[PDB]
Amino acid sequence: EAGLPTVPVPIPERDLDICLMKQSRRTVQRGGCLQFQNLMYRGEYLAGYAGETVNLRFDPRDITTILVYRQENNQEVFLTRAHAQGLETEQLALDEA
DNA sequence: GTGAAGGTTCTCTTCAGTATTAATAAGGCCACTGTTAAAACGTACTATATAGACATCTCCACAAAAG
Numbered sequence: 001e002a003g004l005p006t007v008p009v010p011i012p013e014r015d016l017d018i019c020l021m022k023q024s025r026r027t028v029q030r031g032g033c034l035q036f037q038n039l040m041y042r043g044e045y046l047a048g049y050a051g052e053t054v055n056l057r058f059d060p061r062d063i064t065t066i067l068v069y070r071q072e073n074n075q076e077v078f079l080t081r082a083h084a085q086g087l088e089t090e091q092l093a094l095d096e097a
Numbered sequence: 098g099t100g101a102a103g104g105t106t107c108t109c110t111t112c113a114g115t116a117t118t119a120a121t122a123a124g125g126c127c128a129c130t131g132t133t134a135a136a137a138c139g140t141a142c143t144a145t146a147t148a149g150a151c152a153t154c155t156c157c158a159c160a161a162a163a164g
Contacts, residue, residue, distance in 0.1 A: 027154090027155070029155080
């Protein structure tokens with residue numbers, strides 16, 4: 001408590017979580033579909049980005065709601081939550097999948 | 098006429114002619130070329146409208162080292 005140059009900022013816990021999520025590369029393909037571990041997903045703006053690779057963040061405890069990111073101006077930007085179609089109801093862990 | 102047959106003159110004609118307005122024409126066979134529509138007909142430099150043998154990237158699944 002005495003040896004801190006300044007008291008740390010109270011981190012927004014969703015931001016911590018978002019940067020704790022592991023991530024993979026896939027390309028949005030035809031119809032705004034993207035494959036990830038046999039599941040398929042889509043979200044509210046995906047199809048406009050069909051044809052290029054996007055960065056998407058996943059939590060192995062619940063893969064059903066992916067967060068997907070574009071790279072533009074060589075900067076990361078969030079697109080939308082890509083939901084596993086028909087599974088937007090209860091959680092699925094990666095290990096059984 | 099009492100009826101029939103027959104006698105007689107009548108002129109001059111140097112005057113009249115010559116001009117437009119004109120209708121599409123009124124020729125028919127023969128043969129022989131040479132245009133004049135206009136019909137029939139070989140084939141070219143094109144403008145597209147496909148149909149489908151291929152090449153490609155992507156997503157998902159297996160052996161080697163460290164705690």
